[PDB]
Amino acid sequence: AIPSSRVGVKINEWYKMIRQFSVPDAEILKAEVEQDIQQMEEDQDLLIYYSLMCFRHQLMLDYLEPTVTELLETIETPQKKLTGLLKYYSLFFRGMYEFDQKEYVEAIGYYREAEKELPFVSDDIEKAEFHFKVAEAYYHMKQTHVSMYHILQALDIYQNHPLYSIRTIQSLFVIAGNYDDFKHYDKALPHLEAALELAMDIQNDRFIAISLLNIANSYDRSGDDQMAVEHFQKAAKVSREKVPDLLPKVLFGLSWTLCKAGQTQKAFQFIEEGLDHITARSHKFYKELFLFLQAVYKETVDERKIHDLLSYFEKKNLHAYIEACARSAAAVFESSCHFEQAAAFYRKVLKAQEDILKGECLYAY
Amino acid sequence: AIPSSRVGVKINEWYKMIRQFSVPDAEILKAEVEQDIQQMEEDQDLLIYYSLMCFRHQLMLDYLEPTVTELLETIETPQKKLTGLLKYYSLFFRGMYEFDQKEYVEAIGYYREAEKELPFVSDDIEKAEFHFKVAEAYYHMKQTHVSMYHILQALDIYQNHPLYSIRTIQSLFVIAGNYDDFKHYDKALPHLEAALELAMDIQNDRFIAISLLNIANSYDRSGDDQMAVEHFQKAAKVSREKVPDLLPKVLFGLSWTLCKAGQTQKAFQFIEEGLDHITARSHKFYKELFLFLQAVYKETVDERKIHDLLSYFEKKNLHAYIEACARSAAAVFESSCHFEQAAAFYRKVLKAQEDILKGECLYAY
Amino acid sequence: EKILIVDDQYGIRILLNEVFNKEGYQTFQAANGLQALDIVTKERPDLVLLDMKIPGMDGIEILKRMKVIDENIRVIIMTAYGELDMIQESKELGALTHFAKPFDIDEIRDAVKKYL
Amino acid sequence: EKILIVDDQYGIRILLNEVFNKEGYQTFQAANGLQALDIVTKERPDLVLLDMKIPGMDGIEILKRMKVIDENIRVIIMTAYGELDMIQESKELGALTHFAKPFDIDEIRDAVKKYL
Ligand SMILES: [Mg+2]
Ligand SMILES: [Mg+2]
């Protein structure tokens, strides 16, 4: 599937040909875009940008039936709102394209230029939408303070529009997620609870299950295993009954929490259960996380399995998984006073941390 | 000493009284500001804001010799550039005030509003200056990508003005520092070298010493101990001869590097040397870092001293120092296969990391 | 005549507005269900372009409520990644036609002069 | 008459400009040394306000270069956290006076009509 940002930048190129009134080139690019979309990931925002460009493209044809500069002013002046919106999209999707190739500094620059176009748009939801999507980007970029800044602007507008409950819940998740980055799970919890309540009002089962899962993970990480297990099982129930595709993630949290709580026998039950729900189509690695739980919390640690999994993770550059699993292994070995093994895993932890950071900075100004 | 941001927000309050034409209140606040400045840290930007406000305050008096709204338009309209600059400062210093109290989300919001005022300022250095100072803030906020974005805009403008070599060197240091955050010391090095070359051209000894020190730390962290030691000694020379106040920091890098290189006897010499240069007036903790080096790299580790120092650091919430020292201790104990001790320090490392993160997020939206 | 454009996205509204003004129509615009209903009640449009994909208030709900205000109402639905059952259901409720996004400007323009 | 304002900071230049226009003076402005020298050569100001704290080119350097263009040049220096030796040195070179920042607008205004 083609990322919509990739299609967005080709539209930007299409636009360039239009503004220089090159019909042959514009037609080629227009034809290519119409093919790429047939294989593009879902993005209704991209399709809007496409349709507006189709209109702008037609304007070019209608005005060719004079210097480029002159002809350009003739078309744009009467089309202020169109020209302004196109400019906004070209910058937005260019920013997302840079973001998708991990050119973060470039992305930020486009995000900033894009925002400057918002004031010329008489629509508060459009503004919210920009802040929300950018907030997610900054979060992935681990610029968590900036993410919070933006997401708080989105949520403000969303709350003024009670019909936008979905975005409100998603905004609450983002806020909680951001707090999690600073290990302030207690600060995240209130937002997760509001999300749960809102989700139940609109009777959305998926978001009820997800909210409950998020609450459980919050408690698990804050150190309240009892509340964690309680909510995991609540999420499990709603999952098994109405949203089964969440079961693997739900059962892994439950299992991990039970293992850390010393209830490994009970955990092994949900581990085997989760392994049976996993399908080949899946794109997640819960299979490998489940296998790691079995190996490390087993009466006698399965060191070979552990090595193969960590090696597997190393291969796909899954350093976050390495850090988390290595953290667990270190604690398990410490518990039996096997400190040499422990130290070995602690070194893997510190290594994984540095490998994550290095992967976050690929530019070279 | 009073932080200039604190004085800045009082000026903001002074301004509020002016715009509502309250002479008594404006006079009180004006009088207070003039006292605070006598005890304020150096900040020529604050003093400019003060002098402009003094002028704005006088305009108020000259126009009282009509509704607030009407009278306000009468004063502001003819004073576009003044009103615009005042607005810029009020937002800027308010952002810095929030930054200084670790209200980072608030700070960002003011930084953004402040930037929007720049386009109305016909001065490229003023723009650079904003980007530079904000870049430093984002760096301290560990929003390193955003920091890089801003600092690259500053450096661009500075390079267009060859007379601003100092800011250029400082900008190079910031860029290097940012790369360091992602453990890309190899990416930082080129900028540190350009800084060194520039510093030698302008014959600035302090920045020659600092550049050499930065290069040495870069090599030390990239794993080139020989180059590290070589540059440390270069920095040491220029220090002892022209900038001695850098000696403690220079001798600590040299010592630490020598200890990690297994040359502890040679290191102990520079450790004792650094302890003799430290003065009571100092605000740094190189004294405690020196003492930690002695204790942990000693033939027989001084565990009691180590515990007292780490406890001391804990008290002043110096979690960065705890992490670094604990990292060293863990490696030293591992080298003698004392893994129980090692594991203990690894736990202190992971703890310190989380304590740092928690201290970065004090708000509670 | 009167054309009511209903869509939650600024982009679509700008587009169709520029398209229908060029044809000489008197165009109205709404971002959500309530605004759309108030306009139907007050202006009584001759044709409606309804986005069935609006947050918080599904088009199915909006459609029936428009039939309440006017029975012979002329409504064309448009969707982006919309279900086949919501399209089928909308038809049974008297939908003149359905335009998938991205819709062809000419097609939807010719369809307007038709059912108008 | 002609007043040359020399300062690297936009804020100070805006301020003194508004102050001296109010007095009816013909004001010029420079952000750095070279601009200041070009203006002295071309316009030949009757009074100069020189910021001794300018990056890359110290006021001491700028001052002598102004004495080159004109010997009877009238220059008042202003400083922010400036050394006492640079003030003392500037005086020996024929400095009419020195104004510490933040300077009082009235004081520097009265000083202008004086040495002018
Ligand atoms: Mg829609
Ligand atoms: Mg200056």
Coordinates of N, CA, C and O in Angstrom, one line a residue, chain A residues 214-342:
Chain A
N214 N -6.1 0.5 28.2 CA -5.2 1.7 28.6 C -5.2 1.9 30.0 O -4.1 2.2 30.6
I215 N -6.4 1.9 30.7 CA -6.4 2.0 32.1 C -5.6 0.9 32.8 O -4.9 1.2 33.8
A216 N -5.8 -0.3 32.4 CA -5.1 -1.5 32.9 C -3.6 -1.3 32.8 O -2.8 -1.6 33.8
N217 N -3.1 -0.9 31.6 CA -1.7 -0.7 31.4 C -1.2 0.4 32.3 O -0.1 0.4 32.8
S218 N -2.0 1.4 32.5 CA -1.7 2.5 33.4 C -1.4 2.1 34.8 O -0.4 2.4 35.4
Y219 N -2.4 1.3 35.3 CA -2.3 0.7 36.7 C -1.1 -0.2 36.8 O -0.4 -0.3 37.8
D220 N -0.9 -1.1 35.8 CA 0.2 -2.0 35.7 C 1.5 -1.3 35.9 O 2.4 -1.7 36.6
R221 N 1.6 -0.2 35.2 CA 2.9 0.6 35.2 C 3.0 1.5 36.4 O 4.1 1.8 36.8
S222 N 1.9 1.9 37.0 CA 1.9 2.7 38.2 C 2.2 1.8 39.5 O 2.5 2.4 40.6
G223 N 2.1 0.5 39.3 CA 2.4 -0.4 40.4 C 1.1 -1.0 41.1 O 1.3 -1.5 42.2
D224 N 0.0 -0.8 40.6 CA -1.3 -1.3 41.2 C -1.7 -2.5 40.4 O -2.7 -2.5 39.7
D225 N -1.0 -3.6 40.6 CA -1.3 -4.9 39.9 C -2.8 -5.4 40.0 O -3.3 -5.9 39.1
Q226 N -3.3 -5.2 41.2 CA -4.7 -5.7 41.5 C -5.7 -4.9 40.5 O -6.5 -5.5 39.9
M227 N -5.6 -3.6 40.5 CA -6.4 -2.8 39.6 C -6.1 -3.1 38.2 O -7.0 -3.1 37.3
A228 N -4.8 -3.3 37.9 CA -4.4 -3.7 36.5 C -5.1 -4.9 36.1 O -5.8 -5.0 35.0
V229 N -5.0 -6.0 36.9 CA -5.6 -7.3 36.5 C -7.1 -7.1 36.4 O -7.7 -7.7 35.5
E230 N -7.7 -6.4 37.3 CA -9.2 -6.1 37.3 C -9.6 -5.5 35.9 O -10.6 -6.0 35.3
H231 N -8.9 -4.5 35.5 CA -9.3 -3.8 34.2 C -8.9 -4.7 33.0 O -9.6 -4.7 32.0
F232 N -7.8 -5.4 33.1 CA -7.4 -6.3 32.0 C -8.6 -7.2 31.7 O -9.0 -7.4 30.6
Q233 N -9.1 -7.8 32.8 CA -10.2 -8.8 32.7 C -11.5 -8.1 32.2 O -12.3 -8.8 31.4
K234 N -11.7 -6.9 32.5 CA -12.8 -6.1 32.0 C -12.7 -5.9 30.5 O -13.6 -6.1 29.7
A235 N -11.4 -5.5 30.1 CA -11.1 -5.4 28.6 C -11.2 -6.7 27.9 O -11.7 -6.8 26.8
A236 N -10.8 -7.8 28.6 CA -10.9 -9.1 28.0 C -12.3 -9.5 27.7 O -12.7 -10.0 26.6
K237 N -13.2 -9.3 28.7 CA -14.6 -9.6 28.6 C -15.2 -8.9 27.3 O -15.8 -9.6 26.4
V238 N -15.2 -7.6 27.3 CA -15.7 -6.8 26.2 C -15.1 -7.2 24.9 O -15.7 -7.2 23.8
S239 N -13.8 -7.6 24.9 CA -13.1 -8.1 23.8 C -13.7 -9.4 23.2 O -14.1 -9.5 22.1
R240 N -13.6 -10.5 24.1 CA -14.1 -11.8 23.7 C -15.6 -11.7 23.1 O -16.0 -12.5 22.3
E241 N -16.3 -10.8 23.6 CA -17.8 -10.7 23.3 C -18.1 -9.8 22.1 O -19.1 -10.1 21.4
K242 N -17.3 -8.8 21.9 CA -17.6 -7.8 20.8 C -16.4 -7.3 20.0 O -16.6 -6.9 18.9
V243 N -15.2 -7.4 20.5 CA -14.0 -7.0 19.8 C -12.8 -7.9 20.0 O -11.9 -7.5 20.7
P244 N -12.9 -9.1 19.4 CA -11.9 -10.1 19.6 C -10.5 -9.8 19.1 O -9.5 -10.3 19.6
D245 N -10.4 -8.9 18.1 CA -9.1 -8.6 17.5 C -8.2 -7.8 18.5 O -7.1 -7.6 18.2
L246 N -8.8 -7.5 19.6 CA -8.0 -6.8 20.7 C -7.4 -7.8 21.7 O -6.6 -7.5 22.5
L247 N -7.9 -9.1 21.6 CA -7.5 -10.1 22.5 C -6.0 -10.3 22.7 O -5.6 -10.4 23.9
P248 N -5.3 -10.5 21.6 CA -3.9 -10.7 21.7 C -3.2 -9.6 22.6 O -2.5 -10.0 23.5
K249 N -3.5 -8.4 22.3 CA -2.9 -7.3 23.1 C -3.4 -7.3 24.6 O -2.6 -7.1 25.5
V250 N -4.6 -7.6 24.7 CA -5.2 -7.6 26.1 C -4.6 -8.8 26.9 O -4.3 -8.6 28.0
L251 N -4.5 -10.0 26.3 CA -4.0 -11.1 27.0 C -2.5 -11.0 27.3 O -2.0 -11.7 28.2
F252 N -1.8 -10.3 26.5 CA -0.4 -10.1 26.8 C -0.1 -9.2 28.0 O 0.8 -9.5 28.8
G253 N -0.9 -8.1 28.1 CA -0.9 -7.3 29.3 C -1.2 -8.0 30.5 O -0.5 -8.0 31.5
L254 N -2.3 -8.8 30.4 CA -2.8 -9.6 31.5 C -1.7 -10.6 32.0 O -1.4 -10.7 33.1
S255 N -1.1 -11.3 31.0 CA -0.1 -12.3 31.2 C 1.2 -11.7 31.9 O 1.6 -12.2 32.9
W256 N 1.7 -10.6 31.3 CA 2.9 -10.0 31.8 C 2.7 -9.5 33.2 O 3.5 -9.8 34.1
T257 N 1.5 -8.9 33.4 CA 1.2 -8.4 34.8 C 1.1 -9.5 35.8 O 1.6 -9.4 36.9
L258 N 0.5 -10.6 35.4 CA 0.4 -11.8 36.3 C 1.8 -12.4 36.6 O 2.0 -12.8 37.7
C259 N 2.7 -12.4 35.6 CA 4.0 -12.9 35.7 C 4.8 -12.1 36.7 O 5.6 -12.6 37.6
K260 N 4.7 -10.8 36.6 CA 5.4 -9.8 37.5 C 4.8 -9.9 38.9 O 5.5 -9.6 39.9
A261 N 3.6 -10.4 39.0 CA 2.9 -10.5 40.3 C 3.2 -11.9 40.9 O 2.7 -12.2 42.0
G262 N 4.0 -12.7 40.2 CA 4.4 -14.0 40.7 C 3.3 -15.1 40.5 O 3.5 -16.2 41.0
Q263 N 2.3 -14.8 39.7 CA 1.2 -15.7 39.4 C 1.4 -16.3 38.1 O 0.5 -16.2 37.2
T264 N 2.6 -17.0 37.9 CA 2.9 -17.5 36.5 C 2.0 -18.6 36.0 O 1.8 -18.6 34.8
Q265 N 1.6 -19.4 36.9 CA 0.7 -20.5 36.4 C -0.6 -20.0 35.8 O -1.0 -20.5 34.8
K266 N -1.2 -19.0 36.5 CA -2.4 -18.4 36.0 C -2.1 -17.7 34.7 O -2.8 -17.7 33.7
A267 N -0.9 -17.1 34.6 CA -0.4 -16.3 33.4 C -0.3 -17.3 32.2 O -0.8 -16.9 31.1
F268 N 0.3 -18.4 32.4 CA 0.6 -19.3 31.3 C -0.7 -19.7 30.6 O -0.7 -20.0 29.4
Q269 N -1.8 -19.7 31.3 CA -3.1 -20.0 30.7 C -3.5 -19.0 29.7 O -3.9 -19.3 28.6
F270 N -3.3 -17.7 30.0 CA -3.7 -16.6 29.1 C -2.7 -16.5 28.0 O -3.0 -16.0 26.9
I271 N -1.4 -16.9 28.3 CA -0.4 -16.9 27.3 C -0.7 -17.8 26.2 O -0.7 -17.5 25.0
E272 N -1.0 -19.1 26.5 CA -1.4 -20.1 25.5 C -2.7 -19.7 24.8 O -2.8 -20.0 23.6
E273 N -3.6 -19.0 25.5 CA -4.8 -18.5 24.9 C -4.5 -17.5 23.9 O -5.2 -17.5 22.8
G274 N -3.6 -16.6 24.2 CA -3.3 -15.5 23.2 C -2.6 -16.0 22.0 O -2.8 -15.5 20.9
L275 N -1.8 -17.0 22.1 CA -1.0 -17.6 21.0 C -2.0 -18.3 20.0 O -1.7 -18.5 18.9
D276 N -3.2 -18.7 20.5 CA -4.1 -19.4 19.7 C -5.0 -18.5 18.9 O -5.6 -18.9 17.9
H277 N -5.1 -17.2 19.3 CA -5.9 -16.2 18.7 C -5.1 -15.5 17.5 O -5.7 -14.9 16.6
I278 N -3.8 -15.6 17.6 CA -2.9 -14.9 16.6 C -3.1 -15.5 15.2 O -3.0 -16.8 15.1
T279 N -3.2 -14.7 14.2 CA -3.3 -15.1 12.9 C -2.1 -14.8 12.0 O -1.4 -13.8 12.4
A280 N -1.9 -15.5 10.9 CA -0.7 -15.2 10.1 C -0.8 -13.8 9.5 O 0.3 -13.2 9.2
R281 N -2.0 -13.3 9.2 CA -2.2 -12.0 8.6 C -1.6 -10.9 9.5 O -1.2 -9.9 8.9
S282 N -1.6 -11.1 10.8 CA -1.1 -10.1 11.7 C 0.2 -9.4 11.3 O 1.0 -10.0 10.6
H283 N 0.3 -8.2 11.7 CA 1.5 -7.4 11.5 C 2.3 -7.1 12.8 O 3.3 -6.4 12.8
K284 N 1.7 -7.6 13.9 CA 2.3 -7.3 15.2 C 3.3 -8.4 15.6 O 3.4 -9.5 14.9
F285 N 4.0 -8.2 16.7 CA 4.9 -9.2 17.2 C 4.5 -9.8 18.6 O 5.4 -10.3 19.3
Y286 N 3.2 -9.7 18.9 CA 2.7 -10.3 20.1 C 3.1 -11.8 20.3 O 3.2 -12.3 21.4
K287 N 3.3 -12.4 19.1 CA 3.7 -13.8 19.1 C 5.1 -14.0 19.8 O 5.3 -14.9 20.6
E288 N 6.0 -13.0 19.5 CA 7.3 -13.1 20.0 C 7.4 -12.6 21.5 O 8.2 -13.1 22.3
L289 N 6.5 -11.7 21.8 CA 6.4 -11.2 23.2 C 5.8 -12.4 24.1 O 6.2 -12.6 25.2
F290 N 4.8 -13.1 23.5 CA 4.2 -14.2 24.3 C 5.3 -15.3 24.5 O 5.4 -15.8 25.6
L291 N 6.0 -15.6 23.4 CA 7.1 -16.6 23.6 C 8.2 -16.2 24.6 O 8.7 -17.0 25.3
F292 N 8.4 -14.9 24.6 CA 9.4 -14.4 25.6 C 8.9 -14.6 27.0 O 9.7 -14.9 27.9
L293 N 7.7 -14.3 27.3 CA 7.1 -14.5 28.6 C 7.2 -15.9 29.0 O 7.6 -16.2 30.2
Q294 N 6.9 -16.9 28.2 CA 7.0 -18.3 28.5 C 8.4 -18.6 28.9 O 8.7 -19.3 29.9
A295 N 9.4 -18.1 28.1 CA 10.8 -18.5 28.2 C 11.4 -18.0 29.5 O 12.2 -18.7 30.2
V296 N 11.1 -16.7 29.9 CA 11.8 -16.1 31.0 C 11.1 -16.3 32.3 O 11.8 -16.3 33.3
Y297 N 9.8 -16.6 32.3 CA 9.1 -16.8 33.6 C 8.9 -18.3 33.9 O 8.3 -18.7 34.9
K298 N 9.4 -19.1 33.0 CA 9.4 -20.6 33.2 C 10.2 -21.0 34.4 O 11.2 -20.3 34.8
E299 N 9.8 -22.0 35.1 CA 10.5 -22.5 36.3 C 12.0 -22.5 36.1 O 12.7 -21.9 36.9
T300 N 12.4 -23.1 35.0 CA 13.8 -23.0 34.6 C 13.9 -22.1 33.3 O 13.4 -22.5 32.3
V301 N 14.5 -21.0 33.4 CA 14.6 -20.0 32.3 C 15.1 -20.7 31.0 O 16.0 -21.4 31.0
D302 N 14.3 -20.4 29.9 CA 14.7 -20.9 28.6 C 15.7 -19.9 27.9 O 15.2 -19.1 27.1
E303 N 16.9 -20.0 28.2 CA 17.9 -19.0 27.8 C 18.2 -19.1 26.3 O 18.4 -18.0 25.7
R304 N 18.1 -20.2 25.7 CA 18.3 -20.4 24.2 C 17.1 -19.7 23.5 O 17.4 -18.9 22.5
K305 N 15.9 -19.9 23.9 CA 14.7 -19.3 23.3 C 14.9 -17.7 23.4 O 14.6 -17.0 22.4
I306 N 15.3 -17.3 24.6 CA 15.5 -15.9 24.8 C 16.5 -15.2 23.9 O 16.2 -14.2 23.3
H307 N 17.6 -15.9 23.7 CA 18.6 -15.5 22.8 C 18.2 -15.4 21.3 O 18.5 -14.5 20.6
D308 N 17.4 -16.4 20.9 CA 16.9 -16.4 19.5 C 15.9 -15.3 19.3 O 15.9 -14.6 18.2
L309 N 15.0 -15.0 20.3 CA 14.1 -13.9 20.2 C 14.7 -12.5 20.2 O 14.4 -11.7 19.3
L310 N 15.7 -12.3 21.1 CA 16.4 -11.0 21.1 C 17.2 -10.8 19.9 O 17.3 -9.7 19.4
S311 N 17.7 -11.9 19.3 CA 18.4 -11.9 18.1 C 17.5 -11.5 16.9 O 17.8 -10.8 16.0
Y312 N 16.3 -12.1 17.0 CA 15.2 -11.8 16.0 C 14.9 -10.4 16.0 O 14.7 -9.7 15.0
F313 N 14.6 -9.9 17.2 CA 14.3 -8.5 17.4 C 15.4 -7.6 16.9 O 15.2 -6.6 16.2
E314 N 16.7 -7.9 17.2 CA 17.8 -7.2 16.7 C 17.8 -7.0 15.2 O 18.1 -6.0 14.7
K315 N 17.4 -8.1 14.6 CA 17.4 -8.2 13.1 C 16.4 -7.1 12.5 O 16.8 -6.4 11.6
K316 N 15.2 -7.1 13.0 CA 14.2 -6.2 12.6 C 14.3 -4.8 13.2 O 13.4 -4.0 13.2
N317 N 15.4 -4.5 13.9 CA 15.6 -3.3 14.6 C 14.5 -2.9 15.5 O 14.0 -1.8 15.5
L318 N 14.0 -3.9 16.3 CA 13.0 -3.7 17.3 C 13.6 -3.4 18.7 O 13.4 -4.3 19.6
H319 N 14.3 -2.3 18.8 CA 15.1 -2.1 20.0 C 14.2 -1.8 21.2 O 14.6 -2.1 22.4
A320 N 13.0 -1.3 21.0 CA 12.0 -1.1 22.1 C 11.7 -2.4 22.8 O 11.6 -2.5 24.0
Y321 N 11.5 -3.4 21.9 CA 11.1 -4.8 22.4 C 12.3 -5.4 23.2 O 12.2 -6.0 24.2
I322 N 13.5 -5.2 22.7 CA 14.7 -5.7 23.3 C 14.9 -5.1 24.7 O 15.1 -5.8 25.6
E323 N 14.7 -3.7 24.8 CA 14.9 -3.1 26.1 C 13.9 -3.6 27.1 O 14.3 -3.9 28.2
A324 N 12.6 -3.7 26.7 CA 11.6 -4.2 27.6 C 11.8 -5.6 28.1 O 11.7 -5.9 29.3
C325 N 12.0 -6.5 27.1 CA 12.3 -7.9 27.4 C 13.5 -8.1 28.3 O 13.6 -8.9 29.2
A326 N 14.6 -7.4 27.9 CA 15.8 -7.4 28.7 C 15.7 -6.9 30.1 O 16.3 -7.4 31.0
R327 N 14.8 -5.9 30.2 CA 14.4 -5.4 31.6 C 13.9 -6.6 32.4 O 14.3 -6.8 33.5
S328 N 12.9 -7.3 31.8 CA 12.3 -8.4 32.5 C 13.3 -9.5 32.9 O 13.4 -9.9 34.0
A329 N 14.1 -9.9 31.9 CA 15.0 -11.0 32.1 C 16.0 -10.6 33.3 O 16.3 -11.5 34.1
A330 N 16.4 -9.4 33.3 CA 17.3 -8.9 34.4 C 16.7 -9.1 35.8 O 17.4 -9.4 36.7
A331 N 15.4 -8.7 35.8 CA 14.7 -8.8 37.1 C 14.5 -10.3 37.5 O 14.6 -10.6 38.7
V332 N 14.2 -11.1 36.6 CA 14.0 -12.6 36.8 C 15.3 -13.2 37.4 O 15.3 -13.9 38.4
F333 N 16.4 -12.9 36.7 CA 17.7 -13.5 37.2 C 18.1 -12.9 38.5 O 18.6 -13.7 39.4
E334 N 17.9 -11.6 38.7 CA 18.2 -11.0 40.1 C 17.4 -11.8 41.2 O 18.0 -12.0 42.3
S335 N 16.2 -12.2 40.9 CA 15.3 -12.8 41.9 C 15.9 -14.1 42.4 O 15.7 -14.5 43.5
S336 N 16.7 -14.7 41.6 CA 17.4 -16.0 42.0 C 18.9 -15.7 42.3 O 19.7 -16.6 42.3
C337 N 19.2 -14.4 42.4 CA 20.6 -14.0 42.8 C 21.6 -14.4 41.7 O 22.8 -14.5 41.9
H338 N 21.1 -14.6 40.5 CA 22.0 -14.9 39.3 C 22.4 -13.5 38.7 O 21.8 -13.1 37.6
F339 N 23.3 -12.8 39.3 CA 23.6 -11.5 38.9 C 24.5 -11.3 37.7 O 24.5 -10.3 37.0
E340 N 25.3 -12.4 37.4 CA 26.1 -12.3 36.1 C 25.1 -12.3 34.9 O 25.3 -11.5 34.0
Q341 N 24.1 -13.2 34.9 CA 23.1 -13.1 33.9 C 22.4 -11.8 33.9 O 22.1 -11.2 32.9
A342 N 22.1 -11.3 35.1 CA 21.4 -10.0 35.3 C 22.2 -8.9 34.6 O 21.7 -8.2 33.8

